[PDB]
Amino acid sequence: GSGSWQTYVDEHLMCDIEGTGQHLASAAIFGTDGNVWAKSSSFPEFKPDEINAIIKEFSEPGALAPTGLFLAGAKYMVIQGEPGAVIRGKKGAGGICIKKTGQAMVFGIYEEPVNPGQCNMVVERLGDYLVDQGM
């Protein structure tokens, strides 16, 4: 395996999904402390409050409920995740999905015709590999 976090963006997250010709709109990987470790070229203009609120939601599922999930000022409605493990959100023509690993958080952002399950499969396959590697 590779020695750069950026490889997981370029060579997994952003790759065409199951031969559909479609791909995530953007993807990124953040450390637990909230700095960006890897990103795709159209990952949006995130701010620190937003990343912190997501770190909080991994610790305390349900904490985003009154507000929604913001990323680069766009609001996503929270949809069922996996407590402590996966956060998901929906907007009108797309959505977001975020998988926690030991060291990091893997973000995928999608637009139609990509669907919530496709996001989940791409991000969770990577996150499961990373955890197996101690990351």
Sites of contact with Cl ion (CB under 5 A): 31, 33, 35
Distance, C-alpha 41 to centroid of its chain: 15
Measure the CA–CA gap between 83 and 107, rounded to whole angstroms.
16
Count the Cβ atoms, other than its own, within 10 Å of residue 11: 11
Count the Cβ atoms, other than its own, within 10 Å of residue 31: 15
- Give the residue with the Cβ less far from Cl ion, 97 or 104: 104
- Give the residue with the Cβ less far from Cl ion, 37 or 77: 37
User: Residue of minimal CB distance from Cl ion?
Assistant: 31
For the CB of residue 103, give the shortest distance to Cl ion in the complex, in Å.
9
Burial 63-75 (b: 16+ CB within 10 A, else e): ebeeeebbbeeee
- Give the residue with the Cβ less far from Cl ion, 23 or 57: 57
For the CB of residue 30, give the shortest distance to Cl ion in the complex, in Å.
7
Burial 93-103 (b: 16+ CB within 10 A, else e): ebbbbbbbbeb
- Give the residue with the Cβ less far from Cl ion, 22 or 103: 103
For the CB of residue 52, give the shortest distance to Cl ion in the complex, in Å.
12
Measure the CA–CA gap between 38 and 5, rounded to whole angstroms.
6
For the CB of residue 31, give the shortest distance to Cl ion in the complex, in Å.
3
